[PDB]
Enzyme design. Structure first.
Site, PDB file in Angstrom:
ATOM      1  N   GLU A   1      36.545 -53.739 -23.135  1.00  0.00           N
ATOM      2  CA  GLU A   1      36.803 -54.941 -23.925  1.00  0.00           C
ATOM      3  C   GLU A   1      37.728 -55.903 -23.194  1.00  0.00           C
ATOM      4  OE1 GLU A   1      40.887 -54.024 -24.488  1.00  0.00           O
ATOM      5  OE2 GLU A   1      39.986 -55.840 -25.315  1.00  0.00           O
TER       6      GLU A   1
ATOM      7  N   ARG B   1      47.531 -62.688 -29.881  1.00  0.00           N
ATOM      8  CA  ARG B   1      46.380 -62.465 -29.028  1.00  0.00           C
ATOM      9  C   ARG B   1      45.056 -62.793 -29.743  1.00  0.00           C
ATOM     10  NH1 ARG B   1      44.770 -56.726 -27.445  1.00  0.00           N
ATOM     11  NH2 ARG B   1      42.944 -57.063 -26.070  1.00  0.00           N
TER      12      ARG B   1
ATOM     13  N   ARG C   1      36.712 -61.237 -28.867  1.00  0.00           N
ATOM     14  CA  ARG C   1      36.515 -60.298 -27.741  1.00  0.00           C
ATOM     15  C   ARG C   1      35.131 -60.427 -27.080  1.00  0.00           C
ATOM     16  NH1 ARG C   1      41.089 -59.873 -29.093  1.00  0.00           N
ATOM     17  NH2 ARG C   1      42.300 -57.996 -29.537  1.00  0.00           N
TER      18      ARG C   1
ATOM     19  N   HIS D   1      37.257 -58.563 -33.891  1.00  0.00           N
ATOM     20  CA  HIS D   1      37.789 -57.288 -33.455  1.00  0.00           C
ATOM     21  C   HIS D   1      36.841 -56.140 -33.769  1.00  0.00           C
ATOM     22  CE1 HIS D   1      41.006 -54.227 -32.827  1.00  0.00           C
ATOM     23  NE2 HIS D   1      41.322 -55.098 -31.885  1.00  0.00           N
TER      24      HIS D   1
HETATM   25  O1  LIG Z   1      47.577 -57.012 -24.017  1.00  0.00           O
HETATM   26  C1  LIG Z   1      48.959 -56.746 -24.122  1.00  0.00           C
HETATM   27  C2  LIG Z   1      49.795 -57.949 -23.703  1.00  0.00           C
HETATM   28  O2  LIG Z   1      49.377 -58.414 -22.436  1.00  0.00           O
HETATM   29  C3  LIG Z   1      50.266 -59.354 -21.871  1.00  0.00           C
HETATM   30  O3  LIG Z   1      49.820 -59.726 -20.575  1.00  0.00           O
HETATM   31  C4  LIG Z   1      50.337 -60.592 -22.757  1.00  0.00           C
HETATM   32  O4  LIG Z   1      51.329 -61.455 -22.250  1.00  0.00           O
HETATM   33  C5  LIG Z   1      50.626 -60.215 -24.211  1.00  0.00           C
HETATM   34  O5  LIG Z   1      50.504 -61.345 -25.052  1.00  0.00           O
HETATM   35  C6  LIG Z   1      49.652 -59.125 -24.658  1.00  0.00           C
HETATM   36  O6  LIG Z   1      49.817 -58.773 -26.020  1.00  0.00           O
END
Ligand SMILES: OC[C@H]1O[C@@H](O)[C@H](O)[C@@H](O)[C@@H]1O
Length: 92
Positions: free
Chosen positions: A53, A62, A66, A81
């Site tokens: 994913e 976030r 996806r 999701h």
């Molecule tokens: O995926 C986990 C984390 O990755 C990091 O590179 C991002 O800055 C976060 O926003 C994200 O939640």
């Protein structure tokens, strides 16, 4: 019997993610590229580690959007999701 969606009809951000996948990143999120286990069998059933994913960026967290990839280059869209999937048609 999954619905198709034309690649060109996807949100710009989804298309961005497809382009980054093709380039092997670097990706914006740490969880980009993690295995997707397909526990609800919404995608074709395959062996362990078949699917991965990647985040589709949402302007303004976030978020839930996806792309899921398969082992032979299959591509799927999910805005929610993994509640729902469409197979991305690379031809249109
Ligand atoms: O995926 C986990 C984390 O990755 C990091 O590179 C991002 O800055 C976060 O926003 C994200 O939640």
């Amino acid at each position: 019997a999954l619905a198709d969606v034309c690649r060109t009809k996807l949100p710009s951000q989804a298309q961005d993610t497809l382009a980054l996948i093709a380039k092997n990143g670097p990706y914006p999120y740490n969880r980009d590229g993690v295995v997707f286990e397909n526990r609800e069998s919404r995608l074709p059933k395959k062996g362990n580690g078949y699917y991965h994913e990647f985040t589709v960026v949402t302007p303004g967290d976030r978020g839930t959007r996806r792309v899921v990839t398969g082992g032979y280059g299959e591509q799927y869209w999910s805005p929610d999701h993994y509640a729902t999937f469409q197979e991305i048609d690379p031809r249109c």
